[PDB]
Write a protein that binds this ligand. Structure first.
Ligand SMILES: Nc1ncnc2c1ncn2[C@@H]1O[C@H](COP(=O)(O)OP(=O)(O)O)[C@@H](O)[C@H]1O
Length: 286
């Protein structure tokens, strides 16, 4: 399944002339439309914002990373469209949307995630980042891991998305020097404020915040310090009440909470690698 160059007229009519009825998201990153291609493919179409230089870097950032690799836990980039000042990217449609929308449900309605589901989402998210960190040469730093960049497919499996800020780092390097402090408040590693440098350890910190969301159910914007300050008190009160209402037996949660704590370490050298995170999830299964 190669990457398709899609004609602009196809995307024009598939979105009903970029009509608002199919628009499922705009602003911040780009306009996103739910569409059915003329072959019947159910897709998401990202109409890139600010193509003049800023969006063309994000365009190639995805083309260079998610457009060159395929993995069961990464959002599939199916196509692209380059026409003058118009950049478009086309993904396989994820049925249930982003993890953030499900945790903070619209008007408290939709799909509910039990712990058996959230654990599978945490494992799947971890496997996608480990693939970027370990299996990819050059390595890929997502630089913007968060709950809204975890997409849930038809089977509620996690697929990491939004590689618009991703950067390629050589395996011979420990860090990559950038020019802008990318990332979302609530997920930025504390050492990112110190230098214009990102790393895989930075993605691990941001993952730990996501694993906290699957455990606590709260918004990061904070959440990291609140769990650490309550970790010295009653750790039985930091988890999601719905997870405790299911069965007080899996309070397994602290074993995963140790993983989230280890990821959220202020020292990038003490954080585990995502390969270690996966092996820690494998030891809890046994
Ligand atoms: N491949 C996809 N499949 C299904 N829904 C998607 C896809 N990509 C984006 N969306 C939805 O469109 C909305 C806009 O996403 P986007 O602005 O790209 O979010 P982010 O900037 O956090 O990646 C999101 O709420 C997301 O749920």
């Amino acid at each position: 399944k190669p990457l398709r160059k899609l004609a602009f007229a196809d995307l024009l009519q598939a979105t009903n002339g970029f009509h608002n009825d199919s628009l499922i998201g705009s602003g911040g990153f780009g306009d996103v439309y739910k569409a059915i291609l003329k072959d019947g493919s159910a897709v998401a179409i990202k109409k890139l914002i600010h193509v003049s230089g800023q969006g063309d870097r994000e365009f190639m950032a995805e083309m260079e990373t998610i457009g060159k690799i395929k993995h069961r836990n990464l959002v599939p980039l199916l196509g692209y469209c380059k026409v003058g000042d118009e950049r478009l990217l086309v993904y396989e449609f994820m049925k249930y949307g982003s993890l953030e929308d499900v945790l903070h449900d619209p008007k408290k309605a939709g799909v509910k995630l039990n712990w058996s589901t959230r654990r599978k989402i945490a494992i799947g998210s971890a496997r996608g980042l480990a693939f970027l960190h370990h299996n990819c040469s050059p390595h890929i730093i997502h630089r913007d891991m968060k709950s809204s960049n975890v997409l849930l497919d038809e089977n509620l499996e996690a697929r990491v998305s939004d590689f618009g800020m991703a950067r390629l780092m050589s395996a011979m390097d420990t860090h990559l020097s950038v020019s802008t402090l990318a990332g979302t408040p609530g997920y930025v590693p504390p050492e990112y404020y110190q230098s214009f440098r990102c790393s895989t350890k930075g993605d691990v910190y941001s993952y730990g915040v996501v694993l906290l969301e699957l455990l606590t159910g709260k918004r990061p914007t904070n959440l990291v310090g609140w769990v650490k300050q309550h970790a010295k008190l009653r750790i039985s009160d930091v988890f999601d009440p719905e997870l405790m209402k299911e069965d007080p037996a899996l309070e397994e949660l602290l074993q995963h909470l140790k993983v989230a704590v280890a990821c959220l370490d202020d020292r990038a050298w003490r954080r585990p690698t995502m390969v270690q995170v996966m092996a820690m999830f494998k030891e809890i299964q046994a």
